[PDB]
Amino acid sequence: MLVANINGGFESTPAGVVTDLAEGVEGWDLNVGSSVTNPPVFEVLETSDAPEGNKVLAVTVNGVGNNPFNIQATALPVNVRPGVTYTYTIRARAEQDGAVVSFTVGNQSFDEYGRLHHQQITTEWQPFTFEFTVSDQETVIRAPIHFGYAANVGNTIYIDGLAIVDL
Ligand SMILES: [Ca+2]
Ligand SMILES: [Ca+2]
């Protein structure tokens, strides 16, 4: 496959809890804002029902901050071409009922190209997909996933298989 993003399924990363949030995971930038007093646990998990490969990323939300983006996992770099339309697809599920995630893509100047907004994540793996167009002249963009919804407190959200494909 040809994909714009790197390590979309976490398969390059050693299993374990991630403490180096910015650079612990190839292809991703994880971040927790200082308003999150009870920090989440980010973990690359080896599990037999990973949708892709052997690994997934697990995000255990123990608290939240002021905005959903105060807990986020961002695919970076995402290599694209001006004016091209892309398909975004990812798989997600949660440990418990009642999870919410927004899947977004934007540039380095914090212009958003598109998103799937407050998606309802269930206890079973589902695909989440949308299209977006690089409507400016950027070639290296980012794909922030927002986890910091109050509804997620006490839950673990799993993601796998991010693929951003030239449509
Ligand atoms: Ca995987
Ligand atoms: Ca990084």
Place of tokens 């123990």: 62
**23 CA from centroid of ligand 2 (Å):** 4
**57 CA from centroid of ligand 2 (Å):** 15
**65 CA from centroid of ligand 1 (Å):** 28
Q: Please, which residues have CB within 8 angstroms of residue 116's CB and are 6 or more apart in sequence? A: 88, 102, 103, 104, 128, 129, 130
Q: Which of 74, 70, 121, 127 is nearest to 99 (CA)?
A: 121
**Experimentally determined by:** X-ray
Resolution for the entry shown, Å = 1.1
The amino acid at 132: F
CB 162 within 8 A of CB 126: no
Q: In this structure, which ligand is nearest to the CA of 91?
A: 1
C-alpha 161/C-alpha 164 separation (Å) is 10
**136 CA from centroid of ligand 1 (Å):** 31
Q: Which of 149, 139, 148 is nearest to 73 (CA)?
A: 148
55 labelled as ligand-binding?
yes
Peptide bond before 77: cis, by omega within 30 degrees of 0?
Answer: yes
Q: What tokens does 144 get?
A: 């922030």
Place of tokens 């255990």: 60
C-alpha 45/C-alpha 56 separation (Å) is 5
| Residues with a beta carbon under 5 angstroms from ion ligand 2 | 23, 29
Tell me the domains of the chain and their CATH numbers.
1-167 (2.60.120.260)
